[PDB]
């Protein structure tokens, strides 16, 4: 390893050129306080661009007139009088964009003409000049949008829409938070004998549609009332309503029987208990009870007289179905208790009725129009127009038409709509430098609920389902199968490894003000195989402006310092570019260049050859710190070719050498065997480069088996060493040099060392490197519990080498029984625990005995086992299986019990002495 690589010679290279550098600090605290000042300014400007859409949106409403007939309206109707304007290709939006006319999206449920719809296209044409101004006030803006209470939606860039499209903007995550407050909600399902048949299937449906209008500040709990009132939920109190906890209740709802006697008196007395307590958590805000019965001959005056003295719990009742019972008392229940009775005839009417429930709760906001205009940011979701992960900012729009003059004031209440301006996370991730700071380092951000904005494993493909059951006997060769308007709300304690130290970090970061902590942790390696253990130094600050985020910068402790590119000779860097041409592949090696940024580039879809040739052309025009670094990187890896690898020429051995540096230059030297380098050319998303920087010794990685393709005897295994540099009392780790061991050659040493019994060269990770005995020589790189589990189940039990079992929430699997779906998986990851590299044992599986002796090698990543036998009586107990097994999530009934620390918001509008509740009805 010391000879085949020129690591010590590459030490000689960085130590040779004492010029061309100035090692600069990171300070950390300084980088985060600077980056916090930028993410504020990002939100500052977009923040206001709602404020121009709110003020000029209200003014045109006050002068509208209300035209009844229409003989004059010329909009776009983005699903196909009508216009058909030009389209420019763009890369900010990766689609066709218009810039000159607003679009209009109308749901395919509601249109004719309509005196309601068409009259609202009249005045919302006036917004477009305000739309057009902010583009020229500020470039790089994403989808501005006016949603509306009647289902309309206008958005300025105008792109065509993305086979049956449901998409109702009145139920979309960003429209609901900006039109309400948090809700302690409680759904009660009448389950007597009177509801079997048509009215059963509706409630099973209508509850399942109600839970999708929740954000993640809302709380629910489902309580059938019957003879007695119980919670058919396994919760007995209020949940937090994650993505997850909403999935629990739907399997509870879809198995409700129907028989017994209605009472409404044990039921409500069970219900007003639940919204009390004040022990668990709750949002302490607009308390809703919702009552899904079918009619019943009771004005239950008693319970409201005992619990609604103060009238601080509003009651939505709904009646479903086509029973001929009384709808009498139920209309009395809501109209007294500030409710708003609605009625669900059948399927199809369900989507329209369960969304108007939010407009009723907007009544305290419309009575407090001075303070209520704050920008409420929704957390994170995938946009329906296919842009990536976006974050929205919302601000409601009121129907001020009667102010300071007053007037009759009939509908001085319910709002018009919600203005929205979306933000990409890439917009954020270009503010967050991740190119000076050591691939295990990364910015990172947490919302007040404990959810994530910038952890680098967000990865589109939404989360969190049980075992994804699909039958194929139920479907038809037909309809589109909806695309889950579900957000992507990842827990911080599930984005990484859970630890007693990190929970202290998370609970302080979610509200606190400064701080930092340095400690020892387990680190899950990328494309999970491997857990390392190392040190981290990481800080946090809240955003000086809003509270709706807080940053944090994770650092390896050897990463305070970095290399400054500084070339002031201009001939030396041109010679370094001369290395970087493809003409010199026999000279240097296949030199590959990671996709990075500058002025006018593109990304290589595996045509790194094209990107390199595109990159070659750039400096030839020029004949700003990333452009200088790669040039500075270019010759320092070249001198390992011409001064150490040029003098060797295809030894007894190696097969193929390689050098990965940060700055994105990787070189494989023979270049016939290099073209097979089958991994990621991105150094920061590279797997072994990061792992190599953690350890201070040699790292062996076992490739997979079958994997897609020729990773094999063809390939071999991988060696690595981080390169430590001693500048003037400092420690910098720029490069990683790798040797790719020819396997049969390393059999040939392993064979002749045996002749001068069952032995396994084994890694950390339980992956077979090599063995004797020739049955194992084809399995190479398979986890050894799939080979000899009787040893391995014993071997961990007589320790080293232990395991954690995380859960991943975004991997995709194959559905079971009763194409590609995301599902919650498990991941066993094996690691070393304990020192004292001498582990002997004597195994008796049962009725046959045999001998262990396990020897960890020194200054490297290697387990060497000597086991003696196979030929005695066998022991096929099980298989310790790595990889990912599709399984469930954690127990939700017990995760809720010791819940998870967090904070709610601070507005909670409720209960004006004004309002006046006579509508309902």
């Amino acid at each position: 390893a010391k000879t085949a690589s020129g690591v010590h010679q590459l030490v000689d290279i960085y130590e040779k050129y004492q010029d061309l550098y100035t090692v600069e600090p990171n300070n950390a605290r300084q980088l985060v306080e600077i980056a916090a000042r930028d993410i504020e300014k990002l939100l500052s400007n977009r923040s206001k661009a709602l404020v121009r859409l709110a003020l000029e949106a209200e003014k045109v409403q006050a002068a509208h007139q209300w035209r009844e007939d229409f003989a004059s309206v010329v909009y776009y109707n983005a699903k196909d009088q009508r216009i058909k304007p030009v389209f420019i290709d763009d890369a900010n939006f990766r689609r066709q964009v218009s810039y000159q006319h607003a679009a209009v999206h109308i749901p395919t449920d509601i249109y004719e003409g309509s005196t309601i719809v068409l009259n609202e296209l009249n005045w919302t044409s006036a917004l477009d000049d305000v739309f057009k101004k902010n583009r020229e006030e500020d470039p790089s803006l994403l989808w501005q949008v006016f949603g509306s209470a009647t289902g309309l939606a206008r958005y300025y860039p105008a792109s065509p829409w993305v086979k049956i499209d449901l998409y109702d903007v009145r139920r979309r995550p960003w429209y609901i938070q900006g039109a309400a407050s948090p809700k302690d909600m409680l759904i009660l399902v009448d389950v007597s004998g009177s509801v079997s048949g048509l009215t059963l299937k509706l409630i099973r449906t209508s509850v399942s549609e109600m839970l999708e209008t929740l954000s993640d500040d809302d709380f629910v709990n489902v309580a059938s009332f019957n003879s007695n009132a119980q919670d058919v939920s396994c919760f007995q109190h209020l949940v937090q309503a994650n993505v997850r906890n909403k999935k629990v209740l739907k399997d509870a709802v879809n198995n409700i029987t129907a028989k017994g006697i209605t009472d409404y008196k044990k039921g409500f007395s069970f219900a007003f208990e639940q919204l009390l307590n004040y022990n668990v958590s709750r949002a302490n805000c607009n308390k809703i009870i919702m009552l899904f019965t079918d009619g019943g001959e009771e004005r239950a005056q008693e319970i409201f007289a005992k619990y609604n003295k103060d009238k601080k719990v509003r009651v939505f009742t709904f009646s479903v179905g086509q029973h001929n019972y009384d709808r009498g008392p139920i209309q009395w229940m809501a109209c007294e208790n500030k409710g708003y009775y609605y009625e669900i005839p059948s399927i199809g009417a369900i989507r329209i009725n369960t969304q108007e429930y939010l407009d009723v709760l907007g009544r305290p906001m419309v009575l407090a129009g001075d303070k209520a205009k704050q920008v409420q940011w929704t957390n994170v979701y995938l946009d329906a127009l296919e842009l990536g992960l976006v974050i929205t900012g919302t601000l409601p729009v009121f129907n001020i038409t009667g102010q300071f003059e007053n007037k009759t004031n009939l509908k001085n209440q319910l709002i018009l709509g919600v203005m929205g301006v979306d933000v990409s996370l890439e917009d954020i991730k270009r503010l967050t430098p991740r190119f000076t700071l050591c691939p295990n380092g990364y910015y990172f951000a947490i919302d007040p609920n404990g959810y994530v904005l910038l952890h680098p494993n967000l990865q589109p493909k939404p989360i969190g389902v049980g075992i994804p059951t699909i039958n194929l006997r139920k479907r038809r060769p037909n309809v589109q199968n909806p695309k889950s308007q579900e957000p992507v709300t990842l827990d911080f304690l599930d984005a990484e490894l859970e630890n007693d130290i990190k929970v202290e970090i998370r609970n302080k970061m979610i509200d606190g003000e400064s701080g930092e902590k340095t400690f020892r942790t387990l680190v899950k390696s990328q494309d999970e195989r491997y857990i390392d253990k190392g040190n981290r130094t990481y800080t946090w600050t809240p955003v000086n402006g809003t509270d709706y985020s807080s940053l944090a910068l994770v650092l390896p402790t050897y990463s305070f310092y970095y290399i400054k590119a500084k070339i002031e000779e201009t001939i030396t860097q041109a010679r370094y570019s001369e290395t970087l041409k493809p003409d010199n592949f026999e000279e240097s090696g296949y030199t590959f260049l990671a996709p990075r940024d500058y002025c006018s580039d593109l990304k290589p879809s595996d045509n790194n050859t094209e990107f390199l040739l595109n990159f070659n052309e750039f400096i030839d025009r020029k004949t700003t710190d990333l452009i200088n670094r790669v040039l500075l990187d270019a010759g320092f890896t070249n001198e390992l070719v011409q001064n150490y690898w040029s003098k060797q020429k295809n030894i007894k051995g190696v097969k193929a050498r390689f050098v990965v540096t940060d700055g994105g230059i990787t070189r494989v030297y023979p270049k016939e065997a290099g073209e097979n380098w089958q991994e990621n050319p991105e150094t920061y998303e590279d797997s072994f480069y990061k792992r190599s920087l953690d350890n201070d010794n040699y790292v062996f990685t076992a490739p997979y088996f079958n994997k897609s393709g020729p990773g094999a005897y063809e390939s071999g295994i991988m060696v690595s060493k981080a390169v430590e540099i001693y500048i003037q009392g400092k420690l910098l780790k720029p490069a990683v040099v790798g040797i790719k061991i020819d396997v049969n050659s390393w059999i040939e040493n392993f064979t002749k060392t045996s002749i001068r019994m069952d032995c396994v060269i084994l890694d950390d990770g339980g992956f077979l490197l090599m063995a004797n005995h020739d049955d194992y020589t084809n399995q190479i790189g398979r986890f050894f519990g799939e080979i000899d589990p009787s040893l391995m189940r014993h071997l961990v039990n007589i320790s080293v080498y232990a395991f954690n079992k995380s859960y991943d929430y975004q991997s995709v699997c194959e559905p079971g029984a009763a194409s590609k779906q995301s599902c919650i998986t498990e991941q066993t990851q094996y690691f070393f625990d304990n020192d004292s590299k001498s582990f002997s044992g004597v195994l008796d599986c049962g009725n046959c005995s045999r001998i262990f002796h396990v020897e960890k090698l020194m200054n490297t990543n290697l387990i060497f086992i000597m086991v003696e036998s196979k030929g005695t009586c066998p022991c096929d107990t099980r298989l310790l299986i790595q990889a990912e097994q599709t399984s469930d999530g954690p127990d939700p009934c017990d995760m809720v019990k010791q819940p998870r620390y967090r904070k709610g918001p601070d507005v909670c509008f409720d209960n004006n002495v004004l309002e006046d509740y006579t509508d309902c009805x």
Partner: protein
Amino acid sequence: MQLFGGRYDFEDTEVRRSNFDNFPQALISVFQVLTGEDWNSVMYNGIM
């Protein structure tokens, strides 16, 4: 009204509308069988 008692629940979306789930609904439905019109739909729903 005692043999069929409004047991016409079914859990579907089709309007099996000649139910017996009242008194005068049962009176009209019963008359239908005497005129011999459509007493399949009546009967098929009884045995289902």
